[model samples]
Target: SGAIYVGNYRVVNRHLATHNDWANLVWEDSSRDLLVSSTTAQGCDTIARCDCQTGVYYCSSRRKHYPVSFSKPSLIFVEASEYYPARYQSHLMLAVGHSEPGDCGGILRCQHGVVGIVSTGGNGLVGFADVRDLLWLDE
Candidate 1:
């Protein structure tokens, strides 16, 4: 086992509807009763949840060096099930691979035999695709 620094950050909610030319696009709830929040402005930013019943999408007033805005969307990953020693040990890993010249790099993950790959974009790293297939994975 190795020590890892899971960095923490603060999130202050701001109303996106109040901002000029900002609006929430698609908001959905999964069959597992998990709330999936998504918005598309310049692109898209989404937060998928499993436990939480309430869901909201908004913007922030303060701007930082690496601020997540309409230009650069943010995707959050959460685990739904808890680890039980006697029953099972969950393994969730995120991996990325780079290709040779003229080949595009991609991101992949393995979850319950479900594998997903993310393609490269023009804006360098402008957008992303949801690797989480199950609704409960939002948790």
Candidate 2:
């Protein structure tokens, strides 16, 4: 498995759902990262579990509100750039958009559960990779 080091622990690759650009990782036996937000213990269901029946969702407050200009399931072009310490250069992705800014890899959640993860965004739109497109090997 591919391994990456973070702080004092090693995060081992568990699975890469390449179809939608997300992956799962396992931290070293004694280390774990909790899902709780700084202000609350609340959490949302993952797409692997959520049914998304209502179509309502949220990313983080920093990403802005759910899109109203486009209908559900409409793909928008994402204009991406660097944040703080950056790696990749400007790029594009076919993604769902919204009132925007740029921050990558955050969860995209619906009223019933998660739908995707932020992949790219800027200007007045943001985009994410729909988790429903992923095919897990164990499932």
Candidate 3:
């Protein structure tokens, strides 16, 4: 049920993917609307491999946040409860301080590295799935 790859196709908004594990994605192609992926290989870039880290450091959430710096969505960092119910175990929760629809599914960056995925948010905070929990095909 928690497998990363199963031949399923789900577009990651800015990034189209074939394999995923809640937060991280093994994409087939970037969104045609805009190829925003920074790790380009050959004629195109697929994705960037971000290292993970630990501790209660500040992190950045991009996808749906802010207005002036919308493209590089302004970062918000504030400590909240490590435990929150979104689906199940292992999630990073943020106290966003405001309400906004469709502000989830973005990368949660911590100290220059990817740490988690914004799973759900509204009512003044957001939920996230830990990237370390990602599962992959053993081929």
On TM-score, the leading prediction is 2
| CA lDDT of each prediction against the hidden true structure | 0.22, 0.34, 0.32
Clashes of each: 0, 0, 1
Please identify model 1 stretches exceeding 4 Å from their true place. Answer: 1-96, 100-111, 121-128, 133-139
Give the TM-score (vs. native) of candidate 1: 0.18
Selected candidate, larger TM-score, 1 vs 3:
3
Cα TM-score per model:
0.18, 0.38, 0.34
Clashing pairs in 2: none
Model 2 regions more than 4 Å off:
1-44, 48-102
Ranking by TM-score: 2, 3, 1
lDDT of 2 by residue, 1-139 (tens): 1122222222221122132212232221111111111211222234434434334334464444454221244334322233223323221123345533324445555554445445445555554444443333112
Local accuracy of candidate 1 as per-residue lDDT tens digits, 51-83: 221111111111111212122122333223221
Clashing pairs for model 3 are 40-45
Order of models, best lDDT first:
2, 3, 1
